[PDB]
């Protein structure tokens, strides 16, 4: 299995700015290799894996907030555009549940609706996006993960406040319900699921501790969030994926630097360790495992 880092933003002075490049990590060799770039530059991109393809959803290309979506075929190493979303969304969260890709929240910066509570779902067989129930709260820079038949929308920014709130979507009922809030407000948060817990990694609390290295885990049986070992580096705009019992925190922004560093969390030791950095600095990076 490989971890793919998709797009993002290199804000460095010598940088390529908003990225279409893509790189893949092999944990057995501890090496990153560049793969075919996307058609479109996308920072603030949502990424999910469905049926052997990686979907890059939305994002921002340096001039426009995107409704376009493209899919990567690893056998042929090529990206193809698929049907665009109804709404432009950067800072969008993306989850896969029961054969559908869900695009949750985000920001439509066009001269349309700014921070979004809307949600839409992609049916690959029909290759159509359909609007579903909106969230209770507008959330850009939202983390999304799927656990036990529900989609959780974690944190984000409502246009006025960095959020600690969390809500869960039931597709059978088409309804969002608030669950227990996190300990920390987190926009630009990475979320992933491991061993029956949801981990919220990093992010930014813009209330009057800024860019976060803290990490918290949600237990859905008890409906409670617990702080776990913090990362080595503060990371907002961080990509997070789970591979082989470890959580990988990829890239992000530390309040001074766009990051190419990567670190991995071992839940059995409750320790974060640095691993090989990426070739390119990427904040607002999307991360997928395939």
């Amino acid at each position: 299995g490989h971890i793919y880092a998709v797009g993002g933003y290199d804000g460095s002075p010598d940088g390529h700015t908003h990225l279409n490049s893509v790189e893949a990590y092999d944990p057995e060799r501890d090496e990153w290799s560049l793969v075919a770039p996307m058609n479109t530059r996308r920072s603030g991109v949502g990424v999910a894996v469905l049926d052997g393809h990686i979907y890059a959803v939305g994002g921002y290309d340096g001039h426009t907030h995107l409704n376009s979506v493209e899919a990567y075929d690893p056998e042929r190493d090529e990206w193809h555009m698929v049907t665009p979303m109804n709404t432009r969304r950067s800072g969008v969260g993306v989850a896969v549940l029961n054969g559908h890709i869900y695009a949750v929240g985000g920001y439509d910066g066009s001269p349309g609706h700014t921070h979004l509570n809307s949600v839409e779902a992609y049916d690959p067989e029909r290759d159509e996006w359909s609007l579903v129930a909106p969230m209770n709260t507008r959330r850009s820079g939202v983390g999304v993960a799927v656990l036990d038949g529900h989609i959780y929308a974690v944190g984000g920014y409502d246009g006025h406040t960095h959020l600690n709130s969390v809500e869960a979507y039931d597709p059978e009922r088409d309804e969002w319900h608030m669950v227990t809030p996190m300990n920390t407000r987190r926009s630009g948060v990475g979320v992933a699921v491991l061993n029956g817990h949801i981990y919220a990694v990093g992010g930014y609390d813009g209330s009057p501790h800024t860019h976060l290295n803290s990490v918290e885990a949600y237990d859905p049986e008890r409906d409670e969030w617990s702080l776990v070992a913090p990362m080595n580096t503060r990371r907002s705009g961080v990509g997070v994926a789970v591979l082989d019992g470890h959580i990988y925190a990829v890239g992000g922004y530390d309040g001074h630097t766009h990051l190419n560093s990567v670190e991995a969390y071992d839940p059995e030791r409750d320790e974060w360790h640095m691993v090989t950095p990426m070739n390119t600095r990427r904040s607002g990076v999307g991360v997928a495992v395939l």
Side-chain angles (χ1 to χ4, degrees), residues 140-208 210-257:
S140 55
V142 61
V144 175
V146 175
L147 184 53
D148 297 334
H150 294 86
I151 308 179
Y152 290 80
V154 178
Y157 178 65
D158 69 5
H160 317 123
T161 314
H162 298 267
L163 306 164
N164 69 353
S165 66
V166 179
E167 34 193 319
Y169 178 69
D170 175 345
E172 299 214 32
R173 286 205 334 91
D174 186 35
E175 275 282 277
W176 287 94
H177 260 58
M178 284 285 173
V179 297
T180 310
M182 302 183 282
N183 294 284
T184 309
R185 294 173 183 286
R186 306 176 184 272
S187 63
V189 62
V191 172
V193 177
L194 181 48
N195 314 324
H197 300 253
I198 305 180
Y199 289 78
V201 177
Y204 175 70
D205 176 1
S207 318
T210 312
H211 304 267
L212 304 164
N213 65 328
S214 64
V215 180
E216 39 190 316
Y218 179 66
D219 172 335
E221 322 221 39
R222 312 193 155 61
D223 194 26
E224 79 182 18
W225 287 89
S226 65
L227 283 169
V228 297
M231 289 170 305
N232 295 288
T233 307
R234 303 177 179 278
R235 305 175 181 276
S236 55
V238 63
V240 171
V242 171
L243 182 46
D244 287 346
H246 290 86
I247 309 183
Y248 289 76
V250 177
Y253 179 70
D254 74 359
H256 306 266
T257 319

Side-chain angles (χ1 to χ4, degrees), residues 8-11 13 15-27 30-80:
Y9 177 65
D10 172 21
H16 326 252
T17 75
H18 302 270
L19 302 171
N20 57 10
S21 68
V22 179
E23 35 191 321
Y25 180 69
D26 176 328
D30 196 21
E31 297 185 343
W32 288 94
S33 51
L34 267 293
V35 100
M38 295 177 294
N39 294 286
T40 306
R41 292 171 186 290
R42 305 177 183 271
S43 54
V45 63
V47 174
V49 169
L50 180 54
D51 290 332
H53 292 82
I54 303 182
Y55 289 79
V57 178
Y60 176 72
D61 71 4
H63 301 149
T64 320
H65 301 269
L66 301 162
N67 70 324
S68 59
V69 182
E70 48 191 307
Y72 180 67
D73 187 313
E75 332 202 358
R76 334 191 312 195
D77 186 38
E78 67 197 17
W79 287 89
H80 288 119

